[PDB]
């Protein structure tokens, strides 16, 4: 629950410019394409047979929006990530049994998507601050494993 004041400011400043309707869908989609075993968790979502099918799948985009909503909730509560994600941790760990490494993968995919969208504006300091966020979200989600 660190993040320096400067890290919080940088993270907060960039997130205000994030398209909450698109980014979550991109990140989830890329998770499914880059790490194809994760598709096993989403068998009811329909066609995941090609990258184009995944990235254009309505259910993937819809679910991504919920996922990004939870990241937004994390970012508005940076000093209490553990409590923010407590219920999601029970779901992902106790019920879904998603291996925690996958939490880290999704986090870093999100970071690639932020880079992809913002380009040079996603500077090394901004990236470093965001790496703290997604590490914090990942550990918080894996809390029920601890």
């Amino acid at each position: 629950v660190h993040l320096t004041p400067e890290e919080k400011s940088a993270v907060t400043a960039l997130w205000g410019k994030v398209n909450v309707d698109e980014v979550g869908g991109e990140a989830l989609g890329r998770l499914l394409v880059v790490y194809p075993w994760t598709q096993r968790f989403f068998e009811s979502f329909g066609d995941l047979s090609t990258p184009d099918a995944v990235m254009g799948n309505p259910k993937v985009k819809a679910h991504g929006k919920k996922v990004l909503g939870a990241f937004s909730d994390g970012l508005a509560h940076l000093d209490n990530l553990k409590g923010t994600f407590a219920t999601l941790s029970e779901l992902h760990c106790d019920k879904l049994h998603v291996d925690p490494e996958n939490f880290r993968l999704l986090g870093n995919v999100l970071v690639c998507v932020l880079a992809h969208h913002f380009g040079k504006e996603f500077t090394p300091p901004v990236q470093a601050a965001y790496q703290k966020v997604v590490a914090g979200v990942a550990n918080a989600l894996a809390h029920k494993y601890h």
């Binding site: 990258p51 995944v54 970071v111 690639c112 880079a115 992809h116 380009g119 040079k120 090394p124 990236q127």
Partner: protein
């Protein structure tokens, strides 16, 4: 293990890096050192200040090595043998650190090459850098 499509994607995307080799290499290094400061301890005698000539020079070395890997994507253990000697036997780099640099290389490519960084190319670049990392971290001599 790379698919034919992976090899096609990696060659096409890295080909587009071209003369920006040293620049993207140095940027990925600086992103790593800043995001993951423990990685700095592998370079105890380096000048790792921002904009450092030494880091510029090293990024070019890292980028050129990847270009070599791409050119020998079907013969990488042979091609990277000396690099494996260094990272695996001498330095004994923790494979987690290769995951960190690989991610920062992807972040840099995404920040500079938005049109090319498609989900399929992202996926292929990730596997390629994972494969390179495996080769560099294993003692096969």
């Amino acid at each position: 293990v790379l698919s034919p499509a992976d090899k096609t994607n990696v060659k096409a995307a890295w080909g587009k890096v071209g003369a920006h080799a040293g620049e993207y290499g140095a940027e990925a290094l600086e992103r790593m050192f800043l995001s993951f400061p423990t990685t700095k301890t592998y370079f105890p005698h380096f000048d790792l200040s921002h904009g450092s000539a030494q880091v510029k020079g090293h990024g070019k070395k890292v980028a050129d090595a990847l270009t070599n890997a791409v050119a020998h994507v079907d013969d990488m253990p042979n091609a990277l043998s000396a690099l494996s000697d260094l990272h695996a036997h001498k330095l004994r780099v923790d494979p987690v650190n290769f995951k960190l640099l690989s991610h920062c290389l992807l972040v840099t490519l995404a920040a500079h090459l938005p049109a090319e960084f498609t989900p399929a190319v992202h996926a292929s670049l990730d596997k390629f850098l994972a494969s390179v990392s495996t080769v560099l971290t294993s003692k096969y001599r």
